Amino acid sequence: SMSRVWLTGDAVVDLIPDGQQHYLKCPGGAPANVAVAIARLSGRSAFFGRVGNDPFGRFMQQTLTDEQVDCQHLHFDPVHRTSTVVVDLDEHGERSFTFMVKPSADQFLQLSDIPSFQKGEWLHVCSIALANQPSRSSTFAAIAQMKEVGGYVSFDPNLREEVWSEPQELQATVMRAVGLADVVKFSEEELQFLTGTQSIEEGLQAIADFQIPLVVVTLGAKGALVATPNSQQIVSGKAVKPIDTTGAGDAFVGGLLYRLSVAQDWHNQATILDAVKWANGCGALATTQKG
């Protein structure tokens, strides 16, 4: 087997209005979305993290097992509760969502929740895991161990100021993670938010000292900006400019990580280009399903 992508962070149950007096149970959370995306490509994906010993936590355990994601290292906190979102409708029927549990069980990820890592494996992290302690320090420890054993680390800062008890620590904590990552996925505005000169130019030029092996930037319909310290390149979805990646950022990551993980040499420029091709493929695939 040997090839494997580890995923960690917030497993989330979304509650959607199924008309009136009814909510639909929908599994969510960016780490779980990417984890499922990889397993749907017949890839080997495993999830470690913390949910609550509650029905919603059990829903995610069942969902992930069904989707063939290994969740043997999924823990159930007897006290804290699984992250739960309720989306709400306007007078005009326009969506709005509310975090129901703060802070959720995922924020209490412990050092003993971290599984043994093997050489050549991948670890993917989102910013929510870096919001508060003990999850902040536990996640960084997971990163260090993955690298120490000869593994690789990807990072996608799906940043939301909400979950943070101390929003001021965000710019420094996330840019800290960017420094330790092998692959970093940036949204256009995300790259900007860390002081963008209105362009993705010097916003890019800034991170140069970090010497990140691979940086990928979504570009709505323009496709995907691919950045290596040597080169610079755009990999469009060669089809009359398709569409965006609304909610398909996770699917994008999944397709990217699945291909990079099974590569003999993911550092290869040719291998990277093919991986981005799949990533755009997954991203487009998700947004054609009315999503």
Pick from 23, 140, 193, 210: which binds its own copies (CB under 8 A)? 23
Residue nearer to its own copies on the CB measure, 66 or 202: 66
Q: With binding defined as CB under 8 A, does residue 56 bind its own copies?
A: yes
Tokens 């029927």 -> residue: 93
Q: C-alpha distances in angstroms, 184 versus 86, 162, 168, 215, 269?
A: 30, 22, 22, 5, 16
Q: With binding defined as CB under 8 A, does residue 88 bind its own copies?
A: yes
Q: With binding defined as CB under 5 A, does residue 244 bind Na ion?
A: yes
Extract the tokens encoding 20.
């009136």
Residue nearer to its own copies on the CB measure, 88 or 201: 88
Q: Which does 106 bind (CB under 5 to 8 A by kind): its own copies, Na ion, none?
A: none
Mapped onto helix, strand or coil, the DSSP state of residue 147 is helix
Instruction: Name 112's Cβ contacts closer than 8 Å, sequence gap at least 6.
Output: none
Region near its own copies per CB under 8 A, out of 98-106, 190-198, 233-241, 265-273: 98-106
- Least distance to Na ion, CB of residue 95, Å: 10
Does the active-site annotation cover 156?
no
Q: Which does 77 bind (CB under 5 to 8 A by kind): Na ion, its own copies, none?
A: none
Q: Is 22 exposed, middle or buried (0-12, 13-18, 19+ CB in 10 A)?
A: exposed
Tokens 């420890």 -> residue: 141
Annotated ligand binding at 66? The verdict is no
Positions in 66-85 near its own copies (CB under 8 A): 81, 84
Q: Is 242 exposed, middle or buried (0-12, 13-18, 19+ CB in 10 A)?
A: middle
Q: Give the active site residues.
A: 250
Q: Which residues make up each annotated binding site for ADP? A: 92, 185, 218, 220, 223, 240, 247-249, 280
